[PDB]
Amino acid sequence: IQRTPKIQVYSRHPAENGKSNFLNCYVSGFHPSDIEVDLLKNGERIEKVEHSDLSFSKDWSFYLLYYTEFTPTEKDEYACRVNHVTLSQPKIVKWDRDM
Amino acid sequence: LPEPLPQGQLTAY
Amino acid sequence: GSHSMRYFYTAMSRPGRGEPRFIAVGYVDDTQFVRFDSDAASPRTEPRAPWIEQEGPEYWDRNTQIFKTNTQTYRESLRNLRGYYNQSEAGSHIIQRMYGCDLGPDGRLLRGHDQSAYDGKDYIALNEDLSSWTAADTAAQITQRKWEAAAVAEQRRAYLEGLCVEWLRRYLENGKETLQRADPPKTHVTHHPVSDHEATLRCWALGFYPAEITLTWQRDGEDQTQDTELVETRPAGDRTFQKWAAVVVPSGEEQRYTCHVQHEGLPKPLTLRWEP
């Protein structure tokens, strides 16, 4: 009766070090709708991340986009941390500019 | 525009 | 091209944490243009696309009344479905409704939709005839009978064939420079060795609208469906969407692989190869 979220972490524009961009975490395919999503910079929660309005797909599963401005660099690590009733512990997906 | 309210009582499920 | 309007209602009970939240969002194709959230500090219908902002106060108030009344009715509905399934008062449940109209390239009604789910499972759907219902189970049959007794399908039909199409056409005109603009994907193929004998080819599509796209890999002209990793199309946050498809290929066989991209905004379908 429950569906675990798919999670993709990616940038709005192709990543260029030192160039401001948006870091996105798209969570989708989940049910029920309650979901906790944080964007992380070097393991730390980014404050004031924005997100899309709750909507859902034809299969009734929900999706949300969480996003924040960020300026990628070679060393800074970004990630998305998601919890949902279907998850025993938060799932962290790292930002990989190739993905 | 979403579905407007009916003239009478909106029917619940 | 073809276009649709959809509203998506989610009503979510949360025993012990207040009354069920009702949220409605409206879309034309892949563009959200309105929201209403009963949990907002001051719940009101709010614009979410620039082309809807020109609608006057009467429109916003009309929307808000609809959504405020639906908020209350969905709370009744959640109570009712809890009973239909003999469920405890302890659990949180969700009713979803998605509905709206599809137009063909000529702007004529193709069909209407009005579907509902409970806890993520089909519950009741208006049939394509817009006159009859399909209930998923004996609980939904209670709703069906209630809706048959209240001539509900006639209401849904009148909307779907009437105001739904009317307003959709209005939005399409008002937002024509975006809603009726297909932005083709920007594409490229990347190559990443995974070992000495294999490499990943990843075919990228970026910046496209609408979301519908076909991205496939062929080897020697044959589809590699099972061998292709295909991520869900994902929003960029600037209205556009992104997708990629990847295949792991034997080193030295890269040129046997072609990525094929189909999208509304392309003057012609793309065939792409890795370009070392």
UniProtKB/TrEMBL annotation, chain C:
Gene Ontology CC terms: cell surface; early endosome membrane; ER to Golgi transport vesicle membrane; Golgi membrane; lumenal side of endoplasmic reticulum membrane; MHC class I protein complex; phagocytic vesicle membrane; recycling endosome membrane
Keyword DNA repair recorded: no
Residue ranges of domain Ig-like in the record: 185-271
Major location category of this protein: membrane
Subcellular location: Cell membrane
Disulfide bonds: 101-164, 203-259
Protein topology in the membrane: Single-pass membrane protein
Keywords assigned by UniProt, alphabetized: Disulfide bond, Glycoprotein, Immunity, Membrane, MHC I, Signal, Transmembrane, Transmembrane helix
GO biological process, one term: immune response
Family that this chain belongs to: Belongs to the MHC class I family.
Name this protein carries in UniProt: HLA-B*3507
Lineage: Eukaryota, Metazoa, Chordata, Craniata, Vertebrata
